[PDB]
Amino acid sequence: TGNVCIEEIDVDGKFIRLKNTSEQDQPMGGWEMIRKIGDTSVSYKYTSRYVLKAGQTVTIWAANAGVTASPPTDLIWKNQNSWGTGEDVKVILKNSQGEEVAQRSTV
Fold first, then answer.
1. Among 20, 37, 62, 70, fewest CB within 10 Å belongs to which?
2. Cross-link (Glycyl lysine isopeptide (Lys-Gly) (interchain with G-Cter in SUMO2)) at which positions?
C-alpha cells in the first residue's frame, strides 16, 4: 500500500511535483491537478494514457520556466506561466472520479 503524493510546490512557482510512493503503477488518465491562487483555479488534465509508475515522480513545469519537456518525468503545462514567490498557492489532486485524493497548501 502506498499512494500518489503532492511532493512539492516550487517556492519560486515554476513547477509542481507528484510522487507515486506505492509499489503499484497508477494510470493518471482523467486525473485533474488544480492550481489555486486566490480566486483563480487552473486545471491540468493528465493525458488518457499517462501512467505514473511505482516510485516515480512527475513534475509539471510552467510553459515559461525555460525547461524542456522530458516525458514522462517532466511535463510542460501549456500556456500556464510561473506564479512567483510570496504567492499563497494551493494544489488539489482529483482522481479519475472527480473525487479528491490529495491536497497541499504552501504558506
1. 70
2. 94
Stated in angstroms to one decimal place, the resolution of this structure is 2.4
Instruction: For residue 35, give the H/E element and its range.
Output: strand 32-37
Instruction: Give the whole-angstrom CA distance, residue 23 versus residue 25.
Output: 7
Name the one residue in this structure whose C-alpha cell is 500556456. Answer: 79
Report d(CA 105, CA 88) in Å as an integer.
Answer: 8
Q: Where are the domains of the chain?
A: 1-107
The three-class DSSP label of residue 22 is: coil
Structural contact between residues 39 and 88, judged by C-beta atoms closer than 8 angstroms: no
H/E stretch holding 93: strand 90-94
Cβ partners under 8 Å of residue 98, min gap 6: 32
